[PDB]
DNA sequence: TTTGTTTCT
DNA sequence: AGAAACAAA
């Protein structure tokens, strides 16, 4: 139940979530690759824009983030909207709902233009402010999956370019994508937002870090590279979530 | 029907 | 609120 899950996640800790983020999640590997082939500010802007169109995909998330990273490496991006207008219709893994996705990018372009290196630093030190700022730029509910996911992916990109780590705020809830929703239904009849926020508060692990533990493992990522103690805790969690 | 849902009233 | 938004099925 919830108490057992919270105990295991608490033993994994932010330290274990950070390990999974930086060593196991293919999405972080894709971002690391792209960060070597484009300037840091454009990199962060692209990661936010990509997150806001990362829904109802035509491939798995790990496939899609690698397609994004390989596409943009070495490119000279003059307009994020125009870049996506060319990229999406020719993509393999993001072919659905393109007009709607492009309109979202158009809506956020002004906000993205504020993301200088120092503004990125400020938002990484205050991700709750970033959360609300993205939602207000889009005119949407900040509880939505793509907005909360964009904060998570911002934190991946920012830690790469700033060479520093700040934990996600406890108040930002888990991204309710299909993997998380399906898992939650196997575990409980409680709504996922409340279920995972309670586990986050009990364990001390913010929901976006819980997402980093759960989401790669739900896709079948191996835990074998974790050191023995963390590996044991991840094996215990896999018995609950797989 | 939908591989990390949102827009549109 | 929940159907339409596009692709695939």
mmCIF file of N, CA and C in Angstrom, chain A residues 69-132:
data_model
loop_
_atom_site.group_PDB
_atom_site.id
_atom_site.type_symbol
_atom_site.label_atom_id
_atom_site.label_comp_id
_atom_site.label_asym_id
_atom_site.label_seq_id
_atom_site.Cartn_x
_atom_site.Cartn_y
_atom_site.Cartn_z
ATOM 1 N N UNK A 69 16.719 15.096 -30.019
ATOM 2 C CA UNK A 69 18.112 15.447 -29.771
ATOM 3 C C UNK A 69 18.957 15.267 -31.028
ATOM 4 N N UNK A 70 18.755 14.164 -31.750
ATOM 5 C CA UNK A 70 19.531 13.939 -32.960
ATOM 6 C C UNK A 70 19.154 14.924 -34.053
ATOM 7 N N UNK A 71 17.900 15.370 -34.084
ATOM 8 C CA UNK A 71 17.499 16.323 -35.111
ATOM 9 C C UNK A 71 18.200 17.662 -34.926
ATOM 10 N N UNK A 72 18.249 18.164 -33.694
ATOM 11 C CA UNK A 72 18.699 19.529 -33.454
ATOM 12 C C UNK A 72 20.204 19.674 -33.284
ATOM 13 N N UNK A 73 20.938 18.585 -33.072
ATOM 14 C CA UNK A 73 22.377 18.693 -32.865
ATOM 15 C C UNK A 73 23.025 19.385 -34.062
ATOM 16 N N UNK A 74 23.754 20.471 -33.801
ATOM 17 C CA UNK A 74 24.460 21.172 -34.853
ATOM 18 C C UNK A 74 23.628 22.129 -35.680
ATOM 19 N N UNK A 75 22.324 22.228 -35.444
ATOM 20 C CA UNK A 75 21.480 23.101 -36.247
ATOM 21 C C UNK A 75 21.577 24.546 -35.781
ATOM 22 N N UNK A 76 21.346 25.458 -36.718
ATOM 23 C CA UNK A 76 21.266 26.884 -36.427
ATOM 24 C C UNK A 76 19.786 27.246 -36.377
ATOM 25 N N UNK A 77 19.242 27.348 -35.171
ATOM 26 C CA UNK A 77 17.811 27.558 -34.980
ATOM 27 C C UNK A 77 17.542 29.055 -34.918
ATOM 28 N N UNK A 78 16.774 29.556 -35.882
ATOM 29 C CA UNK A 78 16.444 30.974 -35.952
ATOM 30 C C UNK A 78 15.074 31.301 -35.379
ATOM 31 N N UNK A 79 14.148 30.348 -35.411
ATOM 32 C CA UNK A 79 12.813 30.507 -34.851
ATOM 33 C C UNK A 79 12.381 29.135 -34.362
ATOM 34 N N UNK A 80 11.979 29.043 -33.093
ATOM 35 C CA UNK A 80 11.562 27.748 -32.566
ATOM 36 C C UNK A 80 10.277 27.285 -33.239
ATOM 37 N N UNK A 81 9.350 28.212 -33.487
ATOM 38 C CA UNK A 81 8.123 27.860 -34.192
ATOM 39 C C UNK A 81 8.425 27.319 -35.585
ATOM 40 N N UNK A 82 9.207 28.062 -36.370
ATOM 41 C CA UNK A 82 9.514 27.608 -37.722
ATOM 42 C C UNK A 82 10.296 26.304 -37.695
ATOM 43 N N UNK A 83 11.178 26.141 -36.705
ATOM 44 C CA UNK A 83 11.918 24.894 -36.588
ATOM 45 C C UNK A 83 10.971 23.720 -36.378
ATOM 46 N N UNK A 84 9.959 23.894 -35.520
ATOM 47 C CA UNK A 84 9.013 22.815 -35.262
ATOM 48 C C UNK A 84 8.048 22.609 -36.420
ATOM 49 N N UNK A 85 7.722 23.674 -37.156
ATOM 50 C CA UNK A 85 6.852 23.518 -38.315
ATOM 51 C C UNK A 85 7.481 22.600 -39.355
ATOM 52 N N UNK A 86 8.812 22.610 -39.459
ATOM 53 C CA UNK A 86 9.516 21.696 -40.351
ATOM 54 C C UNK A 86 9.738 20.331 -39.702
ATOM 55 N N UNK A 87 10.068 20.317 -38.408
ATOM 56 C CA UNK A 87 10.473 19.087 -37.728
ATOM 57 C C UNK A 87 9.299 18.126 -37.530
ATOM 58 N N UNK A 88 8.201 18.594 -36.932
ATOM 59 C CA UNK A 88 7.125 17.671 -36.559
ATOM 60 C C UNK A 88 6.522 16.902 -37.726
ATOM 61 N N UNK A 89 6.105 17.534 -38.831
ATOM 62 C CA UNK A 89 5.426 16.773 -39.893
ATOM 63 C C UNK A 89 6.304 15.737 -40.548
ATOM 64 N N UNK A 90 7.618 15.865 -40.425
ATOM 65 C CA UNK A 90 8.546 14.916 -41.008
ATOM 66 C C UNK A 90 9.060 13.908 -39.998
ATOM 67 N N UNK A 91 8.609 13.993 -38.749
ATOM 68 C CA UNK A 91 9.121 13.146 -37.687
ATOM 69 C C UNK A 91 8.509 11.755 -37.763
ATOM 70 N N UNK A 92 9.165 10.820 -37.089
ATOM 71 C CA UNK A 92 8.593 9.499 -36.906
ATOM 72 C C UNK A 92 7.717 9.436 -35.665
ATOM 73 N N UNK A 93 8.139 10.074 -34.577
ATOM 74 C CA UNK A 93 7.549 9.790 -33.280
ATOM 75 C C UNK A 93 6.627 10.876 -32.742
ATOM 76 N N UNK A 94 6.337 11.933 -33.514
ATOM 77 C CA UNK A 94 5.383 12.942 -33.054
ATOM 78 C C UNK A 94 4.548 13.465 -34.226
ATOM 79 N N UNK A 95 3.679 12.599 -34.755
ATOM 80 C CA UNK A 95 2.935 12.878 -35.979
ATOM 81 C C UNK A 95 1.493 13.331 -35.758
ATOM 82 N N UNK A 96 0.957 13.215 -34.539
ATOM 83 C CA UNK A 96 -0.442 13.520 -34.261
ATOM 84 C C UNK A 96 -0.613 14.941 -33.741
ATOM 85 N N UNK A 97 -1.752 15.551 -34.076
ATOM 86 C CA UNK A 97 -2.169 16.826 -33.485
ATOM 87 C C UNK A 97 -1.158 17.943 -33.729
ATOM 88 N N UNK A 98 -0.507 17.929 -34.889
ATOM 89 C CA UNK A 98 0.547 18.907 -35.156
ATOM 90 C C UNK A 98 0.049 20.350 -35.165
ATOM 91 N N UNK A 99 -1.068 20.692 -35.827
ATOM 92 C CA UNK A 99 -1.484 22.106 -35.798
ATOM 93 C C UNK A 99 -1.671 22.628 -34.383
ATOM 94 N N UNK A 100 -2.251 21.808 -33.510
ATOM 95 C CA UNK A 100 -2.483 22.221 -32.134
ATOM 96 C C UNK A 100 -1.165 22.390 -31.388
ATOM 97 N N UNK A 101 -0.220 21.479 -31.619
ATOM 98 C CA UNK A 101 1.088 21.565 -30.984
ATOM 99 C C UNK A 101 1.858 22.796 -31.452
ATOM 100 N N UNK A 102 1.822 23.090 -32.754
ATOM 101 C CA UNK A 102 2.503 24.281 -33.255
ATOM 102 C C UNK A 102 1.905 25.557 -32.670
ATOM 103 N N UNK A 103 0.584 25.590 -32.474
ATOM 104 C CA UNK A 103 -0.028 26.769 -31.872
ATOM 105 C C UNK A 103 0.462 26.980 -30.442
ATOM 106 N N UNK A 104 0.695 25.887 -29.697
ATOM 107 C CA UNK A 104 1.257 26.020 -28.350
ATOM 108 C C UNK A 104 2.639 26.656 -28.393
ATOM 109 N N UNK A 105 3.472 26.240 -29.347
ATOM 110 C CA UNK A 105 4.809 26.814 -29.454
ATOM 111 C C UNK A 105 4.727 28.294 -29.797
ATOM 112 N N UNK A 106 3.817 28.659 -30.701
ATOM 113 C CA UNK A 106 3.637 30.069 -31.030
ATOM 114 C C UNK A 106 3.278 30.874 -29.788
ATOM 115 N N UNK A 107 2.436 30.306 -28.925
ATOM 116 C CA UNK A 107 1.978 31.025 -27.744
ATOM 117 C C UNK A 107 3.091 31.249 -26.731
ATOM 118 N N UNK A 108 4.086 30.360 -26.669
ATOM 119 C CA UNK A 108 5.128 30.436 -25.655
ATOM 120 C C UNK A 108 6.400 31.124 -26.153
ATOM 121 N N UNK A 109 6.461 31.508 -27.431
ATOM 122 C CA UNK A 109 7.712 32.041 -27.976
ATOM 123 C C UNK A 109 8.194 33.289 -27.237
ATOM 124 N N UNK A 110 7.284 34.205 -26.896
ATOM 125 C CA UNK A 110 7.704 35.403 -26.172
ATOM 126 C C UNK A 110 8.317 35.036 -24.826
ATOM 127 N N UNK A 111 7.666 34.136 -24.088
ATOM 128 C CA UNK A 111 8.236 33.697 -22.821
ATOM 129 C C UNK A 111 9.619 33.078 -23.020
ATOM 130 N N UNK A 112 9.774 32.219 -24.031
ATOM 131 C CA UNK A 112 11.074 31.581 -24.240
ATOM 132 C C UNK A 112 12.165 32.604 -24.519
ATOM 133 N N UNK A 113 11.817 33.725 -25.155
ATOM 134 C CA UNK A 113 12.812 34.746 -25.456
ATOM 135 C C UNK A 113 13.361 35.424 -24.205
ATOM 136 N N UNK A 114 12.687 35.298 -23.059
ATOM 137 C CA UNK A 114 13.224 35.845 -21.821
ATOM 138 C C UNK A 114 14.303 34.965 -21.204
ATOM 139 N N UNK A 115 14.520 33.755 -21.727
ATOM 140 C CA UNK A 115 15.392 32.782 -21.068
ATOM 141 C C UNK A 115 16.854 32.991 -21.465
ATOM 142 N N UNK A 116 17.422 34.063 -20.921
ATOM 143 C CA UNK A 116 18.864 34.235 -20.904
ATOM 144 C C UNK A 116 19.470 33.241 -19.920
ATOM 145 N N UNK A 117 20.797 33.130 -19.942
ATOM 146 C CA UNK A 117 21.469 32.224 -19.016
ATOM 147 C C UNK A 117 21.128 32.565 -17.571
ATOM 148 N N UNK A 118 21.128 33.853 -17.228
ATOM 149 C CA UNK A 118 20.859 34.211 -15.842
ATOM 150 C C UNK A 118 19.393 33.998 -15.475
ATOM 151 N N UNK A 119 18.469 34.247 -16.409
ATOM 152 C CA UNK A 119 17.062 33.977 -16.123
ATOM 153 C C UNK A 119 16.833 32.485 -15.913
ATOM 154 N N UNK A 120 17.528 31.649 -16.690
ATOM 155 C CA UNK A 120 17.496 30.202 -16.492
ATOM 156 C C UNK A 120 18.002 29.845 -15.102
ATOM 157 N N UNK A 121 19.111 30.464 -14.674
ATOM 158 C CA UNK A 121 19.618 30.235 -13.322
ATOM 159 C C UNK A 121 18.578 30.607 -12.274
ATOM 160 N N UNK A 122 17.928 31.758 -12.449
ATOM 161 C CA UNK A 122 16.926 32.185 -11.481
ATOM 162 C C UNK A 122 15.756 31.211 -11.425
ATOM 163 N N UNK A 123 15.265 30.772 -12.583
ATOM 164 C CA UNK A 123 14.166 29.816 -12.582
ATOM 165 C C UNK A 123 14.588 28.472 -11.993
ATOM 166 N N UNK A 124 15.836 28.044 -12.212
ATOM 167 C CA UNK A 124 16.248 26.765 -11.641
ATOM 168 C C UNK A 124 16.334 26.840 -10.123
ATOM 169 N N UNK A 125 16.653 28.016 -9.579
ATOM 170 C CA UNK A 125 16.598 28.216 -8.145
ATOM 171 C C UNK A 125 15.209 28.453 -7.582
ATOM 172 N N UNK A 126 14.199 28.627 -8.438
ATOM 173 C CA UNK A 126 12.819 28.884 -8.022
ATOM 174 C C UNK A 126 11.884 28.260 -9.064
ATOM 175 N N UNK A 127 11.857 26.926 -9.107
ATOM 176 C CA UNK A 127 11.094 26.245 -10.143
ATOM 177 C C UNK A 127 9.593 26.390 -9.956
ATOM 178 N N UNK A 128 9.132 26.711 -8.743
ATOM 179 C CA UNK A 128 7.719 27.027 -8.566
ATOM 180 C C UNK A 128 7.324 28.256 -9.375
ATOM 181 N N UNK A 129 8.211 29.252 -9.453
ATOM 182 C CA UNK A 129 7.930 30.424 -10.275
ATOM 183 C C UNK A 129 7.906 30.068 -11.756
ATOM 184 N N UNK A 130 8.826 29.203 -12.193
ATOM 185 C CA UNK A 130 8.813 28.764 -13.586
ATOM 186 C C UNK A 130 7.505 28.056 -13.917
ATOM 187 N N UNK A 131 7.059 27.181 -13.013
ATOM 188 C CA UNK A 131 5.823 26.429 -13.187
ATOM 189 C C UNK A 131 4.658 27.355 -13.511
ATOM 190 N N UNK A 132 4.445 28.374 -12.678
ATOM 191 C CA UNK A 132 3.368 29.312 -12.938
ATOM 192 C C UNK A 132 3.584 30.158 -14.177
#
